[PDB]
Amino acid sequence: GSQLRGEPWFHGKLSRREAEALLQLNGDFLVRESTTTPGQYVLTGLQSGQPKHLLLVDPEGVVRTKDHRFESVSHLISYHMDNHLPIISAGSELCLQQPVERKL
């Protein structure tokens, strides 16, 4: 509640396929919690007309990337979003540009 589970862009346990049906323009992102068999979190976004599906794990109780460790998912989002650095994973890069906000 008093944290990640409040964030306008965080859709709780959203299924993989649904999440892809919520992206309209490249740079579209939204976070949800592991669905095949629940555990951690995923970053789903569109780039080039095809979603990418990034994982988010607490390096030390935080949440990390291919070169950085944050405090949480919320911290990860602003670093890339605000600052505008594309998450690069395996030569591929996903630009967080517009959160696909929960409908309310």
Curated annotation (Swiss-Prot):
PTM description: Phosphorylated by activated epidermal growth factor receptor. Phosphorylated in response to FLT4 and KIT signaling. Isoform p46Shc and isoform p52Shc are phosphorylated on tyrosine residues of the Pro-rich domain. Tyrosine phosphorylated in response to FLT3 signaling. Tyrosine phosphorylated by activated PTK2B/PYK2. Tyrosine phosphorylated by ligand-activated ALK. Tyrosine phosphorylated by ligand-activated PDGFRB. Tyrosine phosphorylated by TEK/TIE2.
Chain ranges passing through the membrane: none
Cellular compartment(s): Cytoplasm; Cell junction, Focal adhesion
Tissue expression per record: Widely expressed. Expressed in neural stem cells but absent in mature neurons.
Domain SH2 intervals: 9-100
Quaternary structure and interacting proteins, as annotated: Interacts with CPNE3; this interaction may mediate the binding of CPNE3 with ERBB2. Interacts with the NPXY motif of tyrosine-phosphorylated IGF1R and INSR in vitro via the PID domain. Once activated, binds to GRB2. Interacts with tyrosine-phosphorylated CD3T and DDR2. Interacts with the N-terminal region of SH2B2. Interacts with phosphorylated LRP1 and IRS4. Interacts with INPP5D/SHIP1 and INPPL1/SHIP2. Interacts with TRIM31. Interacts with PTPN6/SHP (tyrosine phosphorylated). Identified in a complex containing FGFR4, NCAM1, CDH2, PLCG1, FRS2, SRC, SHC1, GAP43 and CTT. (Microbial infection) Interacts with herpes simplex virus 1 UL46.
Entry domain remark: In response to a variety of growth factors, isoform p46Shc and isoform p52Shc bind to phosphorylated Trk receptors through their phosphotyrosine binding (PID) and/or SH2 domains. The PID and SH2 domains bind to specific phosphorylated tyrosine residues in the Asn-Pro-Xaa-Tyr(P) motif of the Trk receptors. Isoform p46Shc and isoform p52Shc are in turn phosphorylated on three tyrosine residues within the extended proline-rich domain. These phosphotyrosines act as docking site for GRB2 and thereby are involved in Ras activation.
UniProt name for this protein: SHC-transforming protein 1
Species of provenance: Homo sapiens
Source taxonomy: Eukaryota, Metazoa, Chordata, Craniata, Vertebrata
Residue span relative to the full protein: 482 to 583 of 583
